[PDB]
From TrEMBL, chain C:
Function: Catalytic subunit of the peripheral V1 complex of vacuolar ATPase (V-ATPase). V-ATPase is responsible for acidifying a variety of intracellular compartments in eukaryotic cells.
Highest rank taxon of the organism: Eukaryota
Protein name according to UniProt: V-type proton ATPase subunit G
Protein family according to the UniProt entry: Belongs to the V-ATPase G subunit family.
Organism: Citrus sinensis
Assembly with partners or alone: V-ATPase is a heteromultimeric enzyme made up of two complexes: the ATP-hydrolytic V1 complex and the proton translocation V0 complex.
Automatic annotation (TrEMBL), chain D:
Alphabetically ordered keywords of this record: Hydrogen ion transport, Ion transport, Transport
Domain ATP synthase A/B type C-terminal: 362-461
Protein's organism: Citrus sinensis
Keyword Ubl conjugation: no
InterPro entries referenced in this protein's UniProt entry, alphabetically: ATP-synt_VA_C, ATPase_a/bsu_AS, ATPase_F1/V1/A1_a/bsu_N, ATPase_F1/V1/A1_a/bsu_nucl-bd, ATPase_V1-cplx_bsu, P-loop_NTPase, V-ATPase_su_B/beta
Gene3D superfamilies named among the record's database cross-references: 3.40.50.12240
Protein name according to UniProt: Vacuolar proton pump subunit B
Length: 589, 53, 54, 463
């Protein structure tokens, strides 16, 4: 019930919708075009339709949905591929057979006829349960067990519990009554993208995001449930860091979110993920897709879907965190999302602000980024998850002055700063140590000292060495290495060794594909301790340089060792090398 | 029209009347409970002043 | 020396806590005197709620 | 007394667009009347009636227009402007943006309902600030000091430790003591702060033990953008009640005033108002006045409201509309330099652009020393000459610094090294710091000093 009255491009006016609500999604026309309500002036409505509105007919029916832009969560959310508006691309392609996306597809987000193995918890048929209680878990696939949380805003004494067995989402797995009225819940939960997910308490982040790369792990650490920023426009560093996060990061899940980038780039990345495979610490070999969800909205996709992809991804990440899993979101191109928002604002004729973006761009970006953090779960049993966002930025020409870049730098705690200059100089990590920073180091210092009380001092010494590296750089630039003192020469040599041996990774090489934090800490110790032990001896720089050739080779090889030997063997080898270097530095003095 | 079809519930509404124009667009819920709530919220500073001293 | 100095703190903090608890009890007794102020003012504000005119 | 009336509940909502909710057939509306909107789902949110024309009403809802149905939502007209239930018991508590108690405590029992945006003070009855303040930081007190009733903000770009400086000032705040009941009560507005910053503020304030005299008006970035505009209003109204109507001096603090500017810009762009510079509303000067222009001392009352805002230059540019208008209104600046932060200085206060327009009255003979003004002027003026010498050395060479310029360069170096730097918890007294300030001024010869007379500092004696 409801018919269109005026169709001016994307904007659509439909009469007979007195009961419509603002921002309620609606189905327009026989083709089931999907659009969101904007203005409810009079008894009429106003809808902007995402897909092309060409060919609409006056008095074509309009069908309400009684729900805002929402995502159907539950089993089967992992692995698949979804559009910006939560449209399963893979199943759409299989059903329609052809390649083109049909104008008005109506495939449900998750297949409601597929069977998943279900088994309840030890709860009783007449017990009491509340919102967020974990009443069952499902083996969606191997090694990615999926907990079934009773939806929030739903509570009451238990009435029926489905016994363990094979079931589908259409089955009524749960039914309960709060008052005399009883409600039955399936395995599918719908939640609006704009509304965040209910939380019990925002904890303080207390565990680093071990990305497997030494430069990010030690120099500029990032904590679970913490924002991150990447100036990714070239050098494939964004692809490299995304692959590292998918394969080696501590997160139990990853939710890539791609909006408004080049279509072939998304093709390349979405073909790269299935090829990516990660080995289990127990020796098992798995596929990253078994723990990966992908929301990719190319430029050809409607602008509104491009804007909504980010919120869809963050809501998916929050739902994953609802069962205490550590999940990491990855916004492919926030600049593209901002451009989509700008286009939408221009469609709405909103008053332009700085550089043309709407005045709420900073506010909306902050609202999105504020959802990341380590959070106590809702409902029992007690557990705690985390959501960390590693959303990248694409400043125009590298000038960190655009409002998107400025707002992101103002909100994001940790900025890693990939540099194209290092990429030109053949640097695999490509992380510019001169601009990167980790504002969460003060909070992470508790764990840093618990693991090793000397590690934080080593990090401070390394930061001082990096600061003096540029000083020695202009010193050599203006007068040369001749004017450098023995201590200055030792400091410069140690800085160069740190840059070319530990601060840089080798990625492609099997020995340096993954850098454990243990190996990173031992390498940092074997570098800094040797640097000091050589420093206080000032001894002729040439003499120590000649007599430390074996020590220099050991320091260089302190990163060539493969992780095959494991932590106990590599730690012992690094300790022996450090002791030998200390003996050589002290005895020869 | 009166309460001939539906009425304000007894314990939930101690008394008073509600008067609304046609189609119930504008309603003046002049019940005793709302009257007490309004007078209480208005006279609360006097209550605090007299509780002290 | 530091342990001897801090030993008196273990008693001073407890004494301060007990003093605070007693002061809170006395303040609530003043609110029990407020409950006596209730005994003297409940009828007053109940008759203040005679705004049932016009 | 005039008989009470129950608020009319309407259901004639006949239009929603942006953040503005239209109504029709309103019987006797009132401008800026607070209306709480109950949606069909039953959830309730507040709102103000912006424009009143004829029998219509253009309401601006607070929690957002989402979920409002043109045939199921109900609007109730309370018939009174927004009022904050201020009370003396409100001290030592935390409140939301609109004032909801969020410390797991019972709501405020109001001693009196007071309307926000209170009327101005008759400037005939207005007085002048005449007492210094002991914040606990050296460089702010020694030069460009703060008077008990003076407004002055902190200019500090994003990422700088200005939040830590504000927390240290609030925890170490106190009178000169040259009393506890009338001692500094701090109203701590927090417009658009991050959650981590919010937890930091709560923990730091609870740790210093001064919760008994500090009120937090926290408003996170998650809260609605319009609700951030009323947070400074509520904070300043509570400050006004505490200071003028109770006596104790109030040291009002508002963090991230740029967030308030952004909220103003968003609200104005929503209603499509005439834009000033950088798309900001054309009345931003008046709004920043109604926020800032309340600090001062009233003649008949012993209270005093001292204002210490904290702005943030967006592009680290002083010419941005928000800091420019502030400097027009705020009677002085205390400036924080990113360049000094690059030198690893904990309190990166740059003194070259930092001046207190009321310092000429804070100084005198009742407090400080008789050489305060001249020493401050010299350490303010010779810094510029040292900077010029540094620029000349950069553009010519080390040989350009003559027997005079090299003295200015050494003065600048020692001034940035010893004088400005201070401990994270150092309460450096004025005289002990003024001795080192005199030493810095004496690095230059005691006769080349042009502006200062020799006798002024000669009255004071070293050692």
């Amino acid at each position: 019930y409801g018919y269109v009255r005026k169709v001016s491009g994307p904007v659509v006016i439909a009469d007979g919708m007195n009961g419509a609500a603002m921002y309620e999604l609606v189905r327009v026309g026989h083709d089931n075009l999907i659009g969101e309500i904007i203005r409810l002036e009079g008894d009429s409505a106003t809808i902007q339709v995402y897909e092309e509105t060409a060919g609409l007919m006056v008095n074509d029916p309009v069908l309400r949905t009684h729900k805002p832009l929402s995502v159907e969560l539950g089993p089967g959310i992992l692995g698949n591929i979804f559009d910006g508006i939560q449209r399963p691309l893979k199943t759409i392609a299989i059903r329609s057979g052809d390649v083109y996306i049909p104008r008005g597809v109506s495939v449900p987000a998750l297949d409601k006829d597929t069977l998943w193995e279900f088994q309840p918890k030890k709860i009783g048929e007449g017990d009491l349960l509340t919102g967020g209680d974990l009443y069952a878990t499902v083996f969606e696939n191997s090694l990615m067990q999926h907990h079934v949380a009773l939806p929030p805003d739903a509570m009451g004494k238990v009435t029926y519990v489905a016994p363990a067995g094979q079931y589908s989402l259409k089955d009524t797995v749960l039914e309960l009554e709060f008052q005399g009225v009883k409600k039955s819940f399936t395995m599918l939960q719908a939640w609006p993208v704009r509304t965040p997910r209910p939380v019990s308490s925002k904890l303080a982040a207390d565990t680093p995001l071990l990305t497997g790369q030494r430069v990010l792990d030690a120099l500029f650490p990032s904590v679970l449930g913490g924002t991150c920023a990447i100036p990714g426009a070239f050098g494939c560093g964004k692809t490299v860091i995304s692959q590292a996060l998918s394969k080696y990061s501590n997160s139990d899940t990853v939710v890539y979110v791609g909006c408004g980038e080049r279509g072939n780039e998304m093709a390349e990345v979405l073909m790269d993920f299935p090829q990516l495979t990660m080995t289990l610490p127990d020796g098992r070999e798995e596929s990253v897709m078994k723990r990966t969800t992908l929301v990719a909205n190319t430029s050809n996709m409607p602008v509104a879907a491009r804007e909504a992809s980010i919120y869809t991804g963050i809501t998916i990440a929050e739902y994953f965190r609802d069962m205490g899993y550590n999940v990491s979101m990855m916004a492919d191109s926030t600049s593209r999302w901002a451009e989509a928002l700008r286009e939408i604002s221009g469609r709405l004729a909103e008053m332009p602000a700085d550089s043309g973006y709407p005045a709420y761009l900073a506010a909306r970006l902050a609202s999105f980024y504020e959802r990341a953090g380590k959070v106590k779960c809702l409902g029992g049993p007690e557990r705690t998850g985390s959501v960390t966002i590693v959303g990248a930025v694409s400043p125009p020409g590298g000038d960190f002055s655009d409002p998107v870049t400025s707002a992101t730098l103002s909100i994001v705690q940790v900025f890693w700063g990939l540099d194209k200059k290092l990429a030109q100089r053949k640097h695999f990590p490509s992380v510019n140590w001169l601009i990167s920073y980790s504002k969460y180091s003060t909070a992470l210092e508790s764990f840093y000292e618990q693991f090793d009380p000397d590690f934080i001092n080593i990090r401070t010494k390394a930061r001082e060495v990096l600061q003096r590296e540029d000083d020695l750089n202009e010193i050599v630039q203006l007068v040369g290495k001749d004017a450098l003192a023995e201590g200055d020469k030792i400091t410069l040599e140690t800085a160069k060794l740190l840059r070319e041996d530990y601060l840089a990774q080798n990625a492609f090489t099997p020995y340096d594909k993954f850098c454990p934090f243990y190996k990173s800490v031992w390498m940092m110790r074997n570098i800094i301790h040797f640097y000091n032990l050589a420093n206080q001896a000032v001894i002729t720089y040439t003499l120590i340089k000649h007599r430390l050739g074996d020590l220099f080779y050991r320091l260089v090889s302190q990163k060539f060792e493969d992780p095959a030997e494991g932590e106990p063997a590599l730690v012992a080898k690094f300790k022996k090398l450090h002791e030998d270097l200390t003996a050589g530095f002290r005895a020869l003095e | 029209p009166g309460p001939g079809h539906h009425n304000a519930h007894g314990p939930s509404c101690s008394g008073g009347v509600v008067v609304a124009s046609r189609d119930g667009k504008i309603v003046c819920e002049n019940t005793l409970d709302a009257r007490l709530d309004v007078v209480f919220r208005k006279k609360l500073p006097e209550i605090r002043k007299q509780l002290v001293s | 020396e530091f342990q001897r100095k801090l030993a008196e703190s273990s008693g001073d903090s407890g004494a301060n806590v007990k003093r605070l608890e007693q002061e809170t009890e006395v303040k609530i007794h003043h609110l029990n005197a407020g409950a006596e102020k209730i005994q003297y003012d409940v009828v007053q504000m109940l008759l203040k709620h005679v705004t049932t005119v016009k | 007394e005039g008989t009470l009336e129950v608020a009319m509940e309407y259901r004639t909502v006949t239009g929603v667009a942006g953040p503005l909710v239209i109504l029709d057939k309103v019987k006797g509306p009132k401008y800026y009347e607070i209306v709480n909107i109950r949606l069909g789902d039953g959830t309730m949110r507040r709102g103000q009636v912006l424009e009143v024309d004829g029998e219509k009403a253009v309401v601006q809802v607070f929690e957002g227009t989402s979920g409002i149905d043109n045939k199921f939502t109900t609007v109730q007209f309370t018939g009174e402007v927004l009022k904050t239930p201020v009370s003396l018991d409100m001290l030592g508590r935390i409140f939301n943006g609109s004032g909801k108690p969020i410390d797991n405590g019972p709501p405020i029992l109001p001693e009196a309902y007071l309307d926000i945006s209170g009327s101005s003070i008759n400037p005939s009855e207005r007085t002048y600030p005449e007492e210094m303040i002991q914040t606990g930081i050296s460089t702010i007190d020694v030069m460009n000091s703060i008077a008990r009733g003076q407004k002055i903000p902190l200019f500090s770009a994003a990422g700088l430790p200005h939040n830590e400086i504000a927390a240290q000032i609030c925890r170490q705040a106190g009178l000169v003591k040259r009393g506890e009941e009338d001692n500094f009560a701090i109203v701590f507005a927090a417009m658009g702060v991050n959650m981590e910053t919010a937890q930091f503020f709560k923990r730091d304030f609870e740790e210093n033990g001064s919760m008994e005299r500090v009120t937090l008006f926290l408003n996170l970035a998650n809260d609605p953008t319009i609700e951030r505009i009323i947070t400074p209003r509520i904070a300043l109204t509570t400050a006004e009640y505490l200071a003028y109507e109770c006596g104790k001096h109030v040291l009002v603090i508002l963090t991230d005033m740029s967030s308030y500017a952004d909220a103003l810009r968003e609200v104005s762009a929503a209603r499509e108002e005439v834009p000033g510079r950088r798309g900001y509303p054309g009345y931003m000067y008046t709004d920043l006045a109604q926020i800032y222009e309340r600090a001062g001392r009233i003649e008949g009352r012993k209270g005093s409201i001292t204002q210490i805002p904290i702005l943030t230059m967006p592009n680290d540019d002083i010419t941005h509309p928000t800091p420019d208008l502030t400097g027009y209104i705020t009677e002085g600046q205390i400036y924080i330099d990113r360049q000094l932060q690059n030198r690893q200085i904990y309190p990166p206060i740059n003194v070259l652009p930092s001046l207190s327009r009321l310092m000429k009255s804070a100084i005198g003979e009742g407090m400080t020393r008789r050489d305060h003004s001249d020493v401050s002027n010299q350490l303010y003026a010779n810094y510029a000459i040292g900077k010029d010498v540094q620029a000349m050395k950069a553009v010519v060479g080390e040989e350009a610094l003559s027997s005079e310029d090299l003295l200015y360069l050494e003065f600048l170096d020692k001034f940035e090294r010893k004088f400005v730097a201070q401990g994270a918890y150092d309460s450096r007294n004025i005289f002990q710091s003024l001795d080192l300030a005199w030493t810095l001024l004496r690095i230059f010869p005691r006769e080349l000093l042009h502006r200062i007379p020799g006798k002024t500092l000669d009255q004071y004696y070293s050692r």
